[PDB]
Ligand binder design. Structure first.
Ligand SMILES: [K+]
Ligand SMILES: [K+]
Ligand SMILES: [Mg+2]
Ligand SMILES: [Mg+2]
Ligand SMILES: [Mg+2]
Lengths: 112, 179, 438, 178, 46, 188, 177
RNA sequence: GGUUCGUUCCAUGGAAUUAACGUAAACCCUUGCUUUAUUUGUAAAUAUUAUAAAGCAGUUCACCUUUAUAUAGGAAAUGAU
């Protein structure tokens, strides 16, 4: 909740989980170097055993929004998360209807 | 009695000039200056390529808009005044005519005639001269800080600010794991 | 000497020489290549695909932004219109109808195309044109009658300052207030309709749309004469008509179809096929050896060496007066133009360009309405009406047998399909519309 | 706050409520209600000139404004919509209501949208043909001939450009020497 | 549209928000038949 | 006051109705590799001829257009937004591309060519050029000695940028460009 | 070695190099002093500098060894100098001045002054004519921009009778109804 | 009533004449051929794999059989292709 911006900054299809996944992408952008350091100290077997156990405990106290595995692409037209095409940021269905209308550049009905 | 006379031949001939258009002139003009700003920002030995990489660095500071010297001279003075006054960031004008249009359209709004000296040197240093910081070679592996700089300095993925967030946390862990 | 590495890129010279072969097989005429911007709304290719995944969404934001920009109108307090208070939502059709935008992207700018049907000018221009011509002739006399009296003594000048001109202007307004307002009421309403297509107001909209693509946007607004030559404009007019509770659905469709005139056609010749025969007039079959050496080396006719003479016998030259063999040029601030630009006659040029354009004439029309369109406020079954006039077929291929280029892999190049969704007080309904070109 | 209420406090107050003549107009202005002292002399001197005019000229002015009133008569007439009208069926703006006669007829002066795409495609061909005939020849005045590399030119650098695009791979420089 | 109304509102131009104007008209109809939303409670249930 | 019968039209106008002429390369060393791309062919096939003409006037011997293997991305999506999976349909996005290779061309003249194509670029086409140039050893010295030469050519171009004295919104100059170049390119 | 083939040059009899020159001087001869002067008298200076530079760039020896005819589907279907900008077949020209962001619509007071200033502008060559009142409703500005004739983005209109469209339609609705 | 892969085509009916959609045609891949282009693909090369833009091609010609004389069909590794 503390990561949810008090002023909406989304211009696409807004949703409960769309706004929740956008707040996770910004939290990780600010903590990637700091999170990449803890992951580097945990794997460096040359550092003291205490330095690795400390860096290992701090990485557990990080907020869930900071974890990059939480990020899941969603549809910018329907807010779904299942069947999203990375090249278009939409579900397989929305891609079809827009591809036939000509809204997606270059796409073409395949026949061969 | 409500009758509207059809358009006369004189009126029709007048509408054509507006809708269809008239026979205007066209003066061919092509010099390296008219092409300057569109060239390839390559770091070649030819000065033409280096002068284009220094202009590309001015467009990045000015907002990042392409070089368009053929699509008018208009702009948004309200947004250029805020960026120039309240944000204190540079502004890039594709032509002198676009600079004078922002002046005469804002009530007593003055812009600087070119950048400052310190800003001209910062541009030529990295974009043209390309003065870098050679990542030194680390022999021993136990040198954590010296080895991290080696990697951070050998990739444009880590920006000067990202390398700070990393080193801040790193130094905090190394110091917190000692007797 | 030369560098060693410079020689490592010279030995690798296995280039295949251009043979300049002669054609011994008859060639047919190429297909009709329809415009490229009509396949996808955005005619774009970017090497970094991060500038391409948001266009489908910006299309909706820009469309709603252009729709509201052409609907701009003065505040009733600016023209002294005396707004009649009515909470009811007005449904005005005499406005500018815009279609979905088509953008031509580059790495420098974007050209935005939108077909408009200006119905507000059809009424404003005629209304203001009713003002008798004497109004302007009589007004000119008040300017001379008032200068000989107010700006003069006993019944521009050096002893006439500007302070007196101010008082002299209010006297004319004091007597012609109720009249100058009427003229100003129609003058501004017409100019606003005129500036929407000019840079006086299009430069403000560009600043709004420039925030999406990050490039200066050039406009290519096309003016449509009839609202039936575009499905986007057609499906919206019919939609605004059906939104009224008392709208006669089946009747509003017939009045629109009745306005769609189809060209006279011979159903036999129209459906008759084409026999495959060599066209010896084509520039490819005329000269089977395109090399100027053989063509000009007195092949058949003598002293046609001049390349200009050869081209004049193949293309329609505009500079020539007689139309062949004569380019007599006169021999011994104003606009910089040639001394014969006015002599040039583009009479047959227009006939060549527009004859090389297919799908010009309207030859098909189909309207479909579906949804809740009843009159009473209750749960009732859906409704679906269909009306059509003409055919949506591609004649050049279905009958003549010529090869066509289908858009997006499946769609026909001559049909335009658009859908408009609205809602009554009882539910939603859609209006689908097709329009084909012969 | 609360349930929204309408905004009916919108109206433009007309300056003059009735047609004033130069005499009556100046009288109300010279009434000394709100005006500068030195400015009151200008209106005063103006009123003296008007009253000095003969009655015949004053009569002409009065009849002149009535001629303009009749000239603007057909412009403020409330046109009645046609019985079976199509565009003014529910138009509440009496200003745009016209006869509607011959407003939808086709004068054979326009092609379909699909045709306008092939027409604009020609205007672009001429724009390029105009450039290839008048601007291209000027490129030869600034061209330079190729000279083979000397013996000191041992390196061969490569720089990749995207022609006005920002691509992360436009920063690599490839060199190859023997 | 709000930023479009403010860009051209300085010239005396007006454009109706058919989207928001429709939302407000529907909410008014609900209150006419006593179907509107209740009063937002701002205290714990007690 | 006399009529002169012109024998022919200007060569600039006649050359517009002939196949684009090509200069002959003496050595045949590639100096540029322009790769054009688009989802259509009529704009790509046209601009290819327009580019070969500009290379002839600049004295650059061009080779092409070479049709490179078209790139085909395929997607198979269900026609329905729900259970009906037994019926799907195939989509694709074919990328048609060409290659114009220039040989024995002056480095600077190759840039005027690439500058001319970007100013008059055709809509719907992407471009990527690889420029090759020979140079001597000791590049560090060369790039420093060429500072005064570039400082003169920029004398009249500094008027483009303007900022308040001691711009504070930029902060760390090098970090600004790094994070602003990402915003301009959208992530990278 | 060359880039092309001489197979098409030996048939016409251009084996010798001297014989190739006789084919250019006789068929690709440059403009004479008279033609040059006569050609420079009709075109402006800027249009002539592009012709003098073309005849120097395109050498006649290339047109003889590789000069071919254009049969691609993008060639122009007619010959023309393309010197000027035509009304219909060319994109609308943009030769006007930029607008004024500080200018606003004219009120009742400013509207009259502009109308008066127009009565004097036309009364400087009775009263306004048809060509004057018509140029006042469509070409006179209504804003405080000093009568600016902005450059419009409206595509050029088509002829009053589009070839291929005219001569095929009959009005279904009769005005007498 | 015939014929056709086919409401295809022909003939005919003391009622027919026509329009739209599907169908057909056309389209994409593939096949032979012509021209174009030769890099990042090709040993060489006078151009022949590959790459890919456009154009041509079929049941076309030959042979056999054939109703109401109107519309056609057959033969399938030993006619051409
Ligand atoms: K090679
Ligand atoms: K092949
Ligand atoms: Mg309730
Ligand atoms: Mg029958
Ligand atoms: Mg089929």
């Amino acid at each position: 909740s503390m990561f949810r911006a008090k002023k909406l900054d989304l211009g696409c299809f807004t949703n409960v989980r769309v706004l929740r996944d956008h707040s996770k992408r910004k939290a990780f952008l600010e903590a990637e170097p700091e999170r990449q350091a803890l992951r580097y100290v945990i794997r460096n077997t040359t550092l003291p055993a205490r330095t690795r156990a400390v860096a290992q405990l701090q990485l557990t106290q990080m907020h869930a929004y900071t974890r990059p595995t939480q990020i899941r692409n969603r549809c910018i037209l329907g807010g779904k998360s299942r069947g999203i095409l990375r090249d278009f940021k939409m579900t397989r269905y929305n891609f079809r209807m827009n591809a036939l209308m000509g809204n997606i550049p270059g796409v073409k009905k395949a026949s061969w | 009695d409500d009758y509207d006379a059809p358009p006369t031949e004189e009126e029709k001939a007048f509408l054509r000039g507006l809708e269809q258009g008239k026979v205007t002139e066209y003066v061919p003009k092509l010099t390296p200056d008219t092409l300057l700003g569109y060239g390839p920002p390559v770091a070649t030995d030819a000065a033409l390529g280096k002068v284009e990489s220094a202009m590309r660095t001015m467009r990045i500071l000015g907002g990042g808009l392409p070089f368009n010297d053929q699509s008018g001279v208009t702009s948004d003075p309200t947004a250029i005044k805020h960026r120039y006054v309240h944000e204190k960031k540079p502004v890039f004008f594709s032509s002198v005519e676009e600079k004078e249009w922002v002046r005469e359209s804002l009530d007593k709004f003055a812009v600087s005639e070119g950048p400052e000296k310190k800003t001209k040197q910062k541009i030529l240093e990295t974009s043209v001269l390309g003065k870098y910081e050679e990542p030194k070679y680390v022999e021993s592996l136990t040198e954590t800080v010296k080895m991290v700089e080696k990697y951070q300095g050998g990739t444009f993925s880590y920006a000067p600010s990202d390398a700070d967030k990393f080193n801040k946390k790193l130094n905090q862990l190394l110091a917190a794991g000692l007797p | 000497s030369a560098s060693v590495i410079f020689s490592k890129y010279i030995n690798n010279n296995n280039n295949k020489l251009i043979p300049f072969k002669i054609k011994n097989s008859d060639l047919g005429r190429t297909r009709y290549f329809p415009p490229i911007s009509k396949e996808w709304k955005n005619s774009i290719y970017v090497f970094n695909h991060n500038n391409l995944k948001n266009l489908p969404l910006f299309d909706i934001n820009i469309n709603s932004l252009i729709k509201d920009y052409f609907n701009l109108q003065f505040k009733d307090k600016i023209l002294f219109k005396k707004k009649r208070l009515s909470k009811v939502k007005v449904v005005s059709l005499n406005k500018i109808y815009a279609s979905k935008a088509e953008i031509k992207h580059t790495n420098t700018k974007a050209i935005l195309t939108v077909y408009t049907f200006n119905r507000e000018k059809i009424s404003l221009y005629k209304k203001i044109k009713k003002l008798k011509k004497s109004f302007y002739f009589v007004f000119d006399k008040i300017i001379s009658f008032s200068e000989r009296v107010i700006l003069s003594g006993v019944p521009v000048l050096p002893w006439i300052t500007e302070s007196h001109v101010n008082i002299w202007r209010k006297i004319i307004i004091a007597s012609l207030y109720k009249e100058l307002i009427l003229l100003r009421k129609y003058k501004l309403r017409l100019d606003l309709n005129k500036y929407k297509f000019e840079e006086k107001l299009l430069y403000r909209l560009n600043n709004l749309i420039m925030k999406y693509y990050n490039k200066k946007v050039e406009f290519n607004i096309v003016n449509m004469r009839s609202f039936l030559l575009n499905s986007d404009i057609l499906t919206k007019i019919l939609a605004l008509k059906l939104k009224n509770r008392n709208a006669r659905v089946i009747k509003i469709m017939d009045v629109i179809l009745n306005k769609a005139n189809l060209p006279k056609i011979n159903r036999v010749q129209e459906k008759a096929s084409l026999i495959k025969s060599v066209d010896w007039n084509l520039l490819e079959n005329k000269f089977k050896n395109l090399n100027l050496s053989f063509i000009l080396n007195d092949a058949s006719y003598a002293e046609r060496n001049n390349l200009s003479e050869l081209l004049n016998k193949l293309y329609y030259n505009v500079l020539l007066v007689s139309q062949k063999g004569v380019w007599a040029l006169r021999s011994p601030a104003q606009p910089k133009v040639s001394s014969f630009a006015k002599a040039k006659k583009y009479a047959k040029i227009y006939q060549i360009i527009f004859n090389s354009i297919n799908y010009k004439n309207m030859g098909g029309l189909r309207l479909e309405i579906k949804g809740r369109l009843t009159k009473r406020y209750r749960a009732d079954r859906s409704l679906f009406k269909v009306k059509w006039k003409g055919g949506l077929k591609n004649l050049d291929s279905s009958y003549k047998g010529l090869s066509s280029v289908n858009m997006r892999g499946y769609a026909k190049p001559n049909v335009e399909y658009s859908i408009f969704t609205s809602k009554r007080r009882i539910g939603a309904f859609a209006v689908k519309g097709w329009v084909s070109g012969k | 706050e609360g349930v929204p209420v309408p905004k009916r406090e919108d109206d433009a107050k007309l300056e003059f409520t009735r047609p004033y003549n130069p005499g009556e107009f100046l009288s109300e202005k010279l009434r000394s209600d709100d005006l500068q002292d030195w400015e009151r002399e200008r209106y005063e001197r103006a009123l003296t000139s008007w009253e000095q005019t003969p009655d015949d000229l004053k009569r002409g002015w009065s009849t002149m404004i009535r001629d303009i009133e009749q000239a603007a008569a057909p412009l403020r007439r409330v046109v009645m919509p046609r019985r079976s009208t199509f565009w003014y069926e529910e138009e509440k703006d009496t200003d745009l209501i016209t006869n509607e006669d011959g407003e939808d007829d086709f004068h054979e002066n326009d092609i379909m949208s699909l045709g306008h795409g092939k027409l604009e495609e020609h205007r672009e061909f001429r724009e390029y043909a105009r450039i290839a005939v008048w601007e291209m020849p000027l490129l030869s005045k600034y061209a330079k001939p190729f000279v083979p590399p000397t013996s000191e030119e041992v390196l061969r650098f490569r720089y990749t450009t995207y022609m006005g695009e920002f691509h992360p791979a436009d920063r690599k420089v490839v060199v190859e020497f023997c | 549209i709000r930023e479009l109304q403010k860009e051209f509102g300085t010239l005396g131009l007006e454009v109706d928000d058919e989207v928001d104007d429709d939302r407000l008209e529907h909410l008014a109809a609900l209150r006419a038949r006593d179907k509107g939303a209740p009063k937002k409670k701002r205290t714990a249930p007690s | 006051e006399q009529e002169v019968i012109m024998s022919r039209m200007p060569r600039s106008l006649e050359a517009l109705y002939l196949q684009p002429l090509r200069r002959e390369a003496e050595y045949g060393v590639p100096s540029c590799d322009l790769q054009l791309r688009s989802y259509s062919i009529r704009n790509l096939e046209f601009f290819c001829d327009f580019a070969l003409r500009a290379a002839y006037y600049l004295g650059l011997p061009a080779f092409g257009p070479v049709p490179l293997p078209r790139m085909i991305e395929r997607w198979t999506v269900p026609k329905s937004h729900f259970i009906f999976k037994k019926s799907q349909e195939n989509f694709e996005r074919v990328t048609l591309r060409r290659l114009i290779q220039i040989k024995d061309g002056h480095p600077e003249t190759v840039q005027l060519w690439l500058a001319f194509l970007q100013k008059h670029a055709y809509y719907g086409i992407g471009m990527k050029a690889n420029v090759w140039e020979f140079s001597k050893l000791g590049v560090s010295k060369a790039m420093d000695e060429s500072k005064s030469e570039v400082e003169k050519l920029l004398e009249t171009r500094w008027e483009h940028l303007s900022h308040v004295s001691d711009m504070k919104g930029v902060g760390n100059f090098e970090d600004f460009l790094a994070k602003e170049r990402l915003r301009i390119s959208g992530g990278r | 070695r060359s880039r092309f083939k001489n197979v098409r040059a030996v048939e016409m009899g251009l084996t010798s190099d001297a014989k190739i020159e006789s084919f250019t001087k006789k068929k690709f001869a440059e403009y004479t002093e008279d033609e040059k002067a006569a050609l420079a008298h009709n075109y402006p200076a800027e249009h002539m500098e592009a012709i003098e530079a073309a005849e120097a760039a395109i050498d006649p020896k290339d047109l003889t060894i590789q000069g071919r005819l254009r049969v691609d589907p993008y060639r122009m279907p007619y010959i023309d100098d393309f010197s000027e900008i035509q009304p219909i077949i060319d994109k609308r020209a943009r030769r006007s001045a930029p607008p004024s962001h500080k200018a606003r619509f004219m009120d009742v007071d400013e509207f009259t002054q502009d109308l008066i200033n127009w009565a004097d502008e036309i009364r400087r060559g009775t009263g306004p004519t048809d060509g004057d009142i018509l140029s006042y409703i469509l070409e006179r500005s209504s804003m405080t921009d000093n009568n600016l004739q902005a450059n419009s983005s409206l595509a050029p209109a088509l002829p009053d009778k589009v070839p291929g469209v005219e001569g095929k339609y009959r009005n279904a609705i009769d005005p007498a109804d």
